[PDB]
């Protein structure tokens, strides 16, 4: 399956890059949530 | 044909890599904002507990 091997390799490279996007997206969501929690406390602190 | 499928997978990979570089930029920017807020909150928390005394 020489044609199959080429398909699997291209699929491998395709998914690896997609998983990297998925990883970075999750990390960005997490950081954005941490920013939200800190800014929430920041607003209650400043309003004193 | 499979060649169209192959070219599709290649195009998907290149778009994802371009998307990766953009995400690394945003993540790096967010990390600084989080660090600034965390540093600012520690000052506010101290200043607030400083006023509670007296």
Numbering used by the authors:
A (entry chain B): 1 to 48
B (entry chain A): 2 to 55
Paper lines:
Coiled-coils are important protein–protein interaction motifs present in ∼3% of all eukaryotic proteins. They consist of two or more amphipathic α-helices that wrap around each other’s hydrophobic seams resulting in parallel or antiparallel filamentous supercoils. Here, we present a case study for the phase determination of coiled-coil structures using a combination of native or engineered cysteine crosslinking together with native SAD phasing. In conclusion, our case study shows that cysteine crosslinking and phasing via sulfur-SAD is a particular useful strategy to solve coiled-coil structures by X-ray crystallography.
The first coiled-coil fragment is derived from CEP135, an important protein implicated in centriole formation. The two-stranded parallel coiled-coil fragment encompasses amino acids 82–144 of human CEP135 (referred to as HsCEP135 82–144) that contains one cysteine and one methionine per monomer. Notably, Cys110 of HsCEP135 82–144 is located in a heptad d core position and has been shown to be able to form a disulfide bridge in the context of its two-stranded parallel coiled-coil structure. Thermal denaturation monitored by CD at 222 nm revealed a broad, non-cooperative unfolding profile typical of monomeric helices. These results suggest that under the conditions tried, HsCEP135 82–144 does not form a coiled-coil structure. The thermal unfolding profile of HsCEP135 82–144 under oxidizing conditions revealed a cooperative unfolding profile (Tm of 62°C) characteristic of a well-folded protein. Taken together, these results demonstrate that HsCEP135 82–144 only forms a two-stranded coiled-coil under oxidizing buffer conditions, while Kif21a_M947C forms a monomeric antiparallel coiled-coil structure under both reducing and oxidizing buffer conditions. The final structure contains two monomers in the asymmetric unit forming a two-stranded, parallel and in-register coiled-coil structure, consistent with the previous structure solved by molecular replacement. A strong peak for the disulfide bridge formed by the cysteine residues at position 110 is visible in the anomalous difference map as well as the signal contributed by the methionines. Though the protein construct ranged from amino acids 82–144 of HsCEP135, only residues 82–134 could be resolved.
